[PDB]
Every structure is written in C-alpha cells, then in structure tokens.
Amino acid sequence: VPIQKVQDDTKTLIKTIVTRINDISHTQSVSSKQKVTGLDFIPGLHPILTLSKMDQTLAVYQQILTSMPSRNVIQISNDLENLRDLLHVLAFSKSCHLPWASGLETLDSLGGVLEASGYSTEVVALSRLQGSLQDMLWQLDLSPGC
C-alpha cells in the first residue's frame, strides 16, 4: 500500500491515542493535584526522533507503564501497539526496514531518565507519554527516517 494510506491511519490513531492522555491530563492544574511527579519536571523531552526510535519509545515506555496499576494508562499501553503496527508497514513503503523493539532493550538505559522518583501517579507517565505519541505524528511530515 502507498505511504499515504499508512499515514492516513497513523494520523487518526496518534490523534485518538493522545485523546485518552488528554482526558486524564484535564486535572494537571498548576500545583493542585499534580503531586508526586518526582521533582515537578519533564525529563521525557519531545526531540526529533526517527521511525526506529519511535517504535523503541513505545517499547521502553511499556516497561514503566507496567508499574502503573491504573486502567487509564494500562488501556493506553495496548493502543500504542496500533501506532507501531502502521509504523512497521510505513518504513516498508520507504524502502527502509526497522527492527521490531522487544520492550526490555533499554529498561535501565531509560529508567535513569525518570530515576523512579515516586513514578506511580498517572499524571507523571501521561505527561511523558502525551507528547511522546503526538511526537510520532508531526514526525511523519518532518523526517520519518529508519
């Protein structure tokens, strides 16, 4: 299938996945209930990553999301797979072949980004995962390399 068909489903998927984050992110008021965020900071930056890094970002976030006994963020973990599915078929139409991320490749190489500083609240993982998802969409119009 053409890249444009893959992107059509990826555009709506990312925009729909982020809606679940936004729905529980509606309570991230200024110093109201956004407590236990480790140190009131966002060490999960939103830089320019490639299709290979995009799949890996969802794989490594799953290793932190598993530690979150909150149906709100767990139901979202299954929706991340749907983005990655198209992402693998996307690079195929670009003559590029990316490796399927296992999950447990950089659990510790990334776990230090958060320091596990009371990372048990939804707002925290959601504040990181929110733009992490949208950070795959704009990227398809920037530089979706492999």
Coordinates of C-alpha atoms in Angstrom, one line a residue:
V1 CA 0.0 0.0 0.0
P2 CA 1.2 3.6 -0.6
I3 CA 2.9 5.5 2.3
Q4 CA 0.0 8.0 2.2
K5 CA -2.5 5.2 3.2
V6 CA -0.3 4.1 6.1
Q7 CA 0.0 7.8 7.2
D8 CA -3.8 8.3 6.9
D9 CA -4.5 5.6 9.6
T10 CA -1.4 6.8 11.6
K11 CA -2.6 10.4 11.7
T12 CA -6.0 9.4 13.2
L13 CA -4.5 6.8 15.5
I14 CA -2.0 9.1 17.2
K15 CA -4.7 11.9 17.4
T16 CA -7.1 9.3 19.0
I17 CA -4.5 7.7 21.4
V18 CA -3.5 11.2 22.7
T19 CA -7.2 11.9 23.5
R20 CA -7.0 9.2 26.3
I21 CA -4.0 11.0 27.8
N22 CA -5.8 14.5 27.4
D23 CA -8.9 13.1 29.1
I24 CA -6.9 12.3 32.4
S25 CA -4.5 15.2 31.7
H26 CA -7.5 17.6 32.3
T27 CA -6.6 17.6 36.1
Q28 CA -2.9 18.6 35.6
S29 CA -3.6 22.1 37.2
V30 CA -0.8 24.4 38.4
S31 CA 0.4 22.8 41.8
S32 CA -3.2 21.5 42.6
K33 CA -3.1 17.6 42.3
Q34 CA 0.0 17.0 40.0
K35 CA 2.0 16.0 43.1
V36 CA 4.5 13.1 43.4
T37 CA 5.9 14.0 39.9
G38 CA 9.4 13.2 41.3
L39 CA 10.6 16.8 41.2
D40 CA 7.9 18.8 39.2
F41 CA 9.9 18.3 35.9
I42 CA 9.6 16.6 32.4
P43 CA 12.8 14.6 31.7
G44 CA 10.9 12.9 28.8
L45 CA 11.7 15.6 26.3
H46 CA 10.0 15.6 22.8
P47 CA 13.0 15.9 20.3
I48 CA 13.2 14.8 16.7
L49 CA 13.3 11.0 16.6
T50 CA 13.2 8.6 13.5
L51 CA 10.8 5.6 12.9
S52 CA 13.2 3.2 14.6
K53 CA 13.4 5.4 17.7
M54 CA 9.5 5.9 17.6
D55 CA 8.9 2.1 18.0
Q56 CA 11.6 1.9 20.7
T57 CA 10.0 4.9 22.6
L58 CA 6.7 2.9 23.0
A59 CA 8.6 -0.3 23.9
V60 CA 10.6 1.4 26.7
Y61 CA 7.6 3.4 28.0
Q62 CA 5.7 0.0 28.3
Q63 CA 8.4 -1.0 31.0
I64 CA 7.4 2.0 33.1
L65 CA 3.6 1.7 32.3
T66 CA 3.6 -1.9 33.6
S67 CA 4.5 -0.5 37.1
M68 CA 1.3 1.8 36.9
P69 CA -1.7 -0.2 38.2
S70 CA -4.1 2.4 36.6
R71 CA -6.5 1.2 33.9
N72 CA -6.4 4.7 32.5
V73 CA -2.6 4.3 31.4
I74 CA -2.8 0.4 31.0
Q75 CA -5.6 0.7 28.4
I76 CA -3.5 3.3 26.6
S77 CA -0.5 0.8 26.5
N78 CA -2.5 -1.5 24.2
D79 CA -3.3 1.5 21.9
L80 CA 0.4 2.2 21.5
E81 CA 0.8 -1.2 19.7
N82 CA -1.7 0.1 16.9
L83 CA 0.6 3.0 16.1
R84 CA 3.7 0.7 15.9
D85 CA 1.8 -1.7 13.6
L86 CA 1.5 1.0 10.9
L87 CA 5.0 2.3 11.6
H88 CA 6.5 -1.1 10.6
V89 CA 4.4 -1.1 7.3
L90 CA 5.4 2.6 6.8
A91 CA 9.1 2.1 6.6
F92 CA 8.5 -0.8 4.2
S93 CA 7.0 1.7 1.6
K94 CA 10.1 4.0 2.1
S95 CA 12.5 1.0 1.2
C96 CA 13.6 1.0 4.9
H97 CA 13.5 -2.0 7.3
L98 CA 13.5 -1.2 11.0
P99 CA 14.0 -3.9 13.9
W100 CA 10.9 -4.8 16.0
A101 CA 11.5 -3.4 19.5
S102 CA 11.2 -6.2 22.2
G103 CA 10.4 -3.9 25.2
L104 CA 13.3 -4.9 27.6
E105 CA 16.2 -3.5 25.5
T106 CA 16.8 -0.2 27.4
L107 CA 14.6 -0.6 30.5
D108 CA 17.6 0.5 32.7
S109 CA 19.2 2.8 30.0
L110 CA 15.9 4.8 30.0
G111 CA 14.8 4.1 33.7
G112 CA 17.5 6.7 34.8
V113 CA 15.7 9.5 32.8
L114 CA 12.9 9.2 35.5
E115 CA 15.1 7.9 38.4
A116 CA 11.9 6.1 39.6
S117 CA 11.3 9.2 41.8
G118 CA 7.8 8.2 43.1
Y119 CA 6.7 7.5 39.4
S120 CA 3.4 5.8 40.5
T121 CA 0.9 8.6 39.5
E122 CA -0.9 8.7 36.1
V123 CA -0.2 12.5 35.6
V124 CA 3.6 11.7 35.5
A125 CA 3.6 8.8 32.9
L126 CA 0.8 10.6 31.0
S127 CA 2.8 14.0 31.0
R128 CA 5.7 12.0 29.3
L129 CA 3.6 9.7 27.0
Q130 CA 1.2 12.6 26.0
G131 CA 3.6 14.4 23.6
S132 CA 5.5 11.1 23.0
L133 CA 2.5 9.9 20.9
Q134 CA 1.9 13.3 19.1
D135 CA 5.8 13.3 18.7
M136 CA 5.3 10.4 16.2
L137 CA 2.6 12.3 14.1
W138 CA 4.3 15.6 13.2
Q139 CA 7.5 13.5 12.6
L140 CA 5.9 11.8 9.6
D141 CA 5.8 15.3 8.0
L142 CA 9.4 16.2 9.2
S143 CA 11.9 13.3 8.8
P144 CA 10.5 9.8 9.3
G145 CA 13.9 8.0 8.6
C146 CA 14.9 4.5 9.8

